[PDB]
Amino acid sequence: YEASILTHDSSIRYLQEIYNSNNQKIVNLKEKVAQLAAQCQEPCKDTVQIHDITGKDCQDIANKGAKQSGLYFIKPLKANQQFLVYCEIDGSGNGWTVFQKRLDGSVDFKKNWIQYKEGFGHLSPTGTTEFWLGNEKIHLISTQSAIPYALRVELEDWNGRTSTADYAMFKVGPEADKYRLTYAYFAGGDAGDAFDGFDFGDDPSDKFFTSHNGMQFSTWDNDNDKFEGNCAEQDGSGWWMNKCHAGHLNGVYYQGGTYSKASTPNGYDNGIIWATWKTRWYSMKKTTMKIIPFNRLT
């Protein structure tokens, strides 16, 4: 209101005391701000990590000690640069190099020549993503000097049933020969030999024109099939087409597994099929194509 001069001194010091008191708290606060900064320097922790061990292929890495399935870098002999891959490693010490995966339909497989050559999709440590490693890489892995390779196809329906198809002496040629697919023989498997063709009973040469051994690779922008039309374009995918196919794991992902002649625009069966195990109008739910040295397979 209007205190006395006698009060001015008691008060005058009261302010100086909290003022200094304040400057102190601040000195310590600024300090604490410093300690906080030291805690906010690291980036967010990425769950996905790539393993250190590398080699010519997954089996080579498994031999070097690796034990768990994950992302690794491999560098085949003829490979100019190294590249990332997904290795599946079992308890027996087998290291498969996976080059194809289907499981949800999240990845569009209607890609072009370069895309199928260089690869697309994503690699995950948990092996829960869809992808195509890339023709050139597959060629490089499967044609290392004096190393006979084997291919295993894994299928799963929408009822938890899984089947297999093995092929000995699996090989994929160079771009110069349009990444032609070849193998010595069907190594057996409860999924059946779709690569050998399948009699659809709609013609005499059905079988012959649905076989895949010896077939080059085809994409909409690069036709190399044994049909005057364009399989890859009509079926909208990239694959070793004949006229057209008996086994088609890079086809359109149909939810539920069951689809019809109506589902498609042209009418042709363009799903993820494998005739020797299910009808043309049954697209698988999960798919995986992996390779490993033949000597390693039994």
Binding site: F200, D202, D203, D206, T210, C231, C244, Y268, A275, R280
Partner: peptide, 4 residues
């Protein structure tokens, strides 16, 4: 599949 096949193109009859």
């Amino acid at each position: 599949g096949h193109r009859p």
